[PDB]
């Protein structure tokens, strides 16, 4: 049920860093060691810049909804739009350029171990320190369901 209109586009480069370039077109700041992940909750879409990804472990995009879980198609403009993350591990860019994560696929966000993470289309924007990582095919079973995804590792 995903649509491109369900992408929160609420970016505010108030620190004047130019971080938004890789959303269209070096180091991972405020590094979060994968171990002991924080729990996923409800994220206000007004704080989100660009696509939200979760990792089941396979990568899946999460779109804006209202606070009762109904898909919304306003590019995150409505200040009641949210991402209901609890409904495994997820990551997104917040409006001022900070990469945020919750949960795990211990792991954190897309990271499996401190040296490997799930590949997805916005990996290098969310984690620029992984530009030179190598990619490996992975297969994993979670409760009988088969996952096939690429992993990027150092």
């Amino acid at each position: 049920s995903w649509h491109i209109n369900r992408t929160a586009l609420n970016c505010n480069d108030s620190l004047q860093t130019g971080f938004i370039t890789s959303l269209f077109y070096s180091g991972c700041q405020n590094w979060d060691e994968p171990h002991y992940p924080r729990p996923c909750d409800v994220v206000s879409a007004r704080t989100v810049c660009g696509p939200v990804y979760c990792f089941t472990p396979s990568p899946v995009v999460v779109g804006t909804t209202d606070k009762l879980g109904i898909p919304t198609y306003n590019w995150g403009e409505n200040e009641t739009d949210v991402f209901m993350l609890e409904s495994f591990g997820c990551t997104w860019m917040n409006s001022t350029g900070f990469t945020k994560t919750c949960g795990a696929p211990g792991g954190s966000g897309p990271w499996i171990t401190p040296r490997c993470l799930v590949d997805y289309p916005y990996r290098l924007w969310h984690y620029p320190c992984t530009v030179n990582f190598t990619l490996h095919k992975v297969r994993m079973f979670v409760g009988g369901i088969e996952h096939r995804f690429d992993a990027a590792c150092n």
Partner: antibody
Amino acid sequence: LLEQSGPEVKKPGSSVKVSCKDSDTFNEPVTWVRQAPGQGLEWIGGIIPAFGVTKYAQKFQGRVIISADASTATAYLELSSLRSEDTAVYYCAKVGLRGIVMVGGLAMNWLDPWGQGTQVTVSS
Amino acid sequence: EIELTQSPGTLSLSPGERATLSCRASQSVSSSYLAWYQQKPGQAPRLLIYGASSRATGIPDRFSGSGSGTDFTLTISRLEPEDFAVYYCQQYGSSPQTFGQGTKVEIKR
């Protein structure tokens, strides 16, 4: 550099499509403004080509369409239902990325670079 | 809609003189979101100042901007011949982004 299409001449009630080609920042936000003869500048609308989200000023809503073509790195402005009041120079310009503000896909910042402008004349 | 009022309409000054242009906003604008542009006949506008007081890339030292709230000023400390043109202010903090009506800086003789 942004290269805009050449001048256009149109009868009332027709449509016109002007283009804005850049030569490596295509998916960066593009904003259209117009300048009526002897007037200042007026926001028409814009697009973020990476996602396709468009925004329009109320005075052009339902009467214009902005689009972008990723293969040719070109953005487009289509105005429909033309009247003589639409005679103007139409400018394309890039929204600056550093310090940009986006709300619901509406991108605003200083504007640079600029296209050279496209003259559209609407007349019987 | 935020209206931008520029004064004077026309400024007549000799080359080498200091020029002061004003732009009055109908409502308060954050200084982060005000820019100045230069336009010469038949040409596209050219960004000069952004964020009220930051000079765009390639813009000479003699252009400076200042102001806050509802009153912003563009200053050209010493007019060169290539500086005589039309100048527009722009607010891009609140949609719709709006432009002032322009000040023409004219050669006094």
